[PDB]
Design a protein around this nucleic acid. Structure first.
Lengths: 95, 109, 82, 82, 97, 92, 104, 98, 84
DNA sequence: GATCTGCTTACCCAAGCGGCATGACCGTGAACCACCTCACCAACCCACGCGTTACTATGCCCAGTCGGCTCTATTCATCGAAGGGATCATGCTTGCACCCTAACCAAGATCGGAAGAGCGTCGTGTAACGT
DNA sequence: ACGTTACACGACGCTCTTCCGATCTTGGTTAGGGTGCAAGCATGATCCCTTCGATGAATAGAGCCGACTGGGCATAGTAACGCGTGGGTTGGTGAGGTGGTTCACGGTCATGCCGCTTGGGTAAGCAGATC
């Protein structure tokens, strides 16, 4: 019956990990969902543009990392690049 | 298909769904193919950004002696950090209000 | 003085036509211009480039030819066939 | 039918909007200018939203249509869907 | 005899009060009627889901507040405190509108 | 051997102004403008098709994208030209 | 026989169709979308080139240069709004001196 | 003497440089400036001539637009001379320095 | 075999800033804006060249092409016609 | 002209407290979509060749640049004035909550045809060489 | 002025598989006006300060020359980059079970928080001085 997906299950998990004793209202959860969707759209669009510019037909981790470096400003870019590299290394190291 | 079905968000240690991000990247009209390591990287970046903004919002909500993050707290956590304000400069947050900044000339003498 | 500038302007305007594809040897054009000017004082080789840059905005200076035998060439002009 | 509702944006609204903006003193002729600016901004955004809702074979302007219309002009809105 | 505040005190109180709150400053019903009147020029008998009006109000209030911040910055730049229509015009022109 | 919009821009220019020529820098600017406007309209049409959960880009999506991007009378005239071209296309 | 002539156009609709299909804008592309896009592109190009020619004939010239393109773009409200953020290389600026700075 | 009164050679130069479409910043110092600026990001990275040319055109257009906005701010401030605070206000309103 | 460049931002001479202002439409120029126009140009160039160098680095190239600068300018909402 | 008081009017907060009112969670369930399985080519990676180039370093020379003098047009810094605005008091006009909501429209399946994708052939431009 | 390694590029004809004009309910949403009620808004005094027009004073930017020198061109050398060409390793689907996920919902409760006093703490103007 009009099953719509969201990030409200995962945003709550990330919030509980950071702040163990701080709930989030259903109106701020919508803002966090919109923020996640917007940042995902920005990064994916930049990655697609990067792939098209180099005539590549595949979005690898390189395209996403370059898109993150292009979009995220300064220190945020460095931190997110480190996070993504660590996550990818852990993923390929654990099958 | 005899296995325990280890989800891709558990191998990478993330909390955001790697499978859902991969599905969105595939059916998002971005490229013909999507490498297997791209959803993991994108989910990690998204989770880091969400964790940072939520940490700042919780910090700005404990100051007001509150347990529940509201849109005003997200706006306070975004307008204060320089990198976040630069990344979300054009973004309007509903019921976020504005930062309490008064020019030094309007104040009395 | 400025008479050489006018003569170079006229020679380039009615002897070279802008064309985005073809490339010409850079020395041949100057030699032809000098031969033309030896019929009545030719512009210096360091100023003919400036004049032809002023006349043609979209002109490049490529270095074509095989290895070791690379010679300079104007890119963006050709002979006016007249 | 509706007519002359821009006067519904009262002076004590344009004021207190300036006050949220951080304005101490307010001229007497700025309320009409603010009403005109608000009218033109609303016309642009509502026109974009109406084209969005007409392409969808619909007759109700959904909040998603308004969000997309605002995003088209660079004013991304968080709180109603993304 | 009655306590009469000098010009500027209540203005500063309102500045400090309306920046601490997040409520909508334009009345909901007049703004909804204005939105309906504006939209009747593009499509006759066009219904409005009662959340797009709220989104329009939030966006319009944010736009007006940002414009008034720019207007105040322009007015202070001219060694003035009162904001004038030329300040709004200059702010909108420099923004690129 | 790189595809470009030089020949067609020259044909259009000769159609409107049969005497005035066009330079190479101006031709490059025209090519860049054509590419940029094509990218803008195609991206808007793609977003329109994605919002309504559609998969195809038909003339309707391009028409609505043209309405969205091009301002004022430009949108009206471009829509009229596109509709004329489409109705001429389907009629053999 | 060519599809760009069956629509009575000058721009190519085969090239536009290939760019629309290989540009990854959608899973499928309708047969009427390249025609519409080619018609819109041709109309916009014709409008800008006509204005550029009109601006070049004013300077008693016979070639359209970037200066004439900038003059055509900046002197039409709709075209200026459409190409608002666009910078034209070697196009200069539209001459406009504020009336305050003129002598009196 | 026959000295020009101040304020008219400025208008002559304005009318000269507004109707002319050449490049105002000298090419070689701008190329060297670009090479120095890129010296901090990655070393042993060359620059194409077209890349330097495009950077110069974009920078000149940006600075000309910024100076138009600065002149507008100066005229709004009841002045004729543009000042550093005028540039700062112009960049602040456009959304470049918060 | 290379050179190091220092004290170069002041290679954007005062007459160049004056000419840029004249094309802008400025009648009188305060003497303090050259040191500020140079800084504004430096920060704008730093941003654009950083984006262009990132685009080049992703392409596994060692020379900044014109398309890289065009895309870097397009990212910041400043399109450039004339270089592809 | 500014140093202190004679005190009288407008905003937070820890209480007590009510009372909603919103969020977390427990099962339902139930689509539902991520996952783990052999194959199989296009997509990508890599080695080698040269053409061409970006960056080096001479050569010329004049047009642009740097710097000091002079001067006056422009920007400050004060003074008055008066006229816009700010502030407060009364009297409401109209916005703000709840509903008899009846029409109406946004969705979830239906009839086929209409249409687009994907392969097989066939019509038009050219990287250089002679009279 | 005339032909080719026949490849790029596009168009035509033909299966095969998706995809829409019209309906058919179906019920969830919104606007057919109505009742009260009080709380912002309109209007009007009042006086307050700020902004705006002179008005000298400073001051520094604009012309104007006089030296002077480097950018803007053309040359070459060279290490290196980049495209082209030819071989040699890899993700989506031929898809297909298979089952953990997560999304909705009724409901129950825990507690978060929005409002009535109580009384404190803060600012802030209205009145006392003289070269």
């Amino acid at each position: 019956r009009s099953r719509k997906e969201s990030y409200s299950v995962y945003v709550y998990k990330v919030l509980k990990q950071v702040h163990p004793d701080t709930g989030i209202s259903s109106k701020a959860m919508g803002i966090m969902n919109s923020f996640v969707n917007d940042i995902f759209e920005r990064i994916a669009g930049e990655a697609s543009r990067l792939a098209h510019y180099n005539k590549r037909s595949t979005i690898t981790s390189r395209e996403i990392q370059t898109a993150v470096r292009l979009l995220l400003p300064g220190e945020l870019a460095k931190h997110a690049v480190s996070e993504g590299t660590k996550a990818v290394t852990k993923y390929t190291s654990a099958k | 298909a005899r296995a325990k079905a280890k989800t891709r968000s558990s191998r990478a240690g993330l909390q955001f769904p790697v499978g859902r991000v991969h599905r969105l990247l595939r059916k998002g009209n971005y490229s013909e193919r999507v490498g297997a390591g791209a959803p993991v990287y994108l989910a990690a970046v998204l989770e880091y950004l969400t964790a940072e903004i939520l940490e700042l919002a919780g910090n700005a909500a404990r100051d007001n002696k509150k347990t529940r993050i509201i849109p005003r707290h997200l706006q306070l956590a975004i307008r204060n950090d320089e990198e976040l304000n630069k990344l979300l400069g054009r973004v309007t947050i509903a019921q976020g209000g504005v930062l309490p900044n008064i020019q030094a000339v309007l104040l009395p003498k | 003085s400025n008479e050489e500038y006018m003569y170079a302007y006229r020679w380039i305007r009615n002897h070279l036509e802008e064309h985005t594809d073809t490339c010409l040897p850079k020395q041949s054009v100057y030699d032809a211009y000098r031969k033309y000017c030896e019929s009545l004082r030719p512009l210096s080789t360091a100023n003919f480039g400036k004049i032809i840059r002023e006349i043609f905005p979209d002109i490049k200076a490529r270095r074509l030819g095989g290895r070791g035998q690379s010679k300079y060439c104007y890119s963006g002009i050709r002979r006016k066939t007249l | 039918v509706l007519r002359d509702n821009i006067q519904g944006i009262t002076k004590p609204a344009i004021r207190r909007l300036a006050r949220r903006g951080g304005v101490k003193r307010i001229s007497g002729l700025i309320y009409e200018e603010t009403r005109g600016v608000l009218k033109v901004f609303l016309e642009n955004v509502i026109r974009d939203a109406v084209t969005y809702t007409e392409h969808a074979k619909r007759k109700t302007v959904t909040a998603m249509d308004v969000v997309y219309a605002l995003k088209r002009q660079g004013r991304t809105l968080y709180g109603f869907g993304g | 005899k009655p306590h009469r505040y000098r010009p500027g005190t209540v203005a500063l109180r309102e500045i400090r009060r309306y920046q601490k709150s997040t409520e909508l400053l334009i009345r909901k019903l007049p703004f909804q009627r204005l939105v309906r009147e504006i939209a009747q020029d593009f499509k006759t008998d066009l219904r409005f889901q009662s959340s797009a009006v709220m989104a329009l109000q939030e966006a319009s209030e944010a736009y007006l507040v940002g414009l008034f911040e720019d207007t105040n910055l322009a007015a202070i730049h001219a060694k003035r405190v009162t904001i004038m229509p030329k300040d709004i015009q200059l702010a909108r022109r420099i923004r690129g509108e």
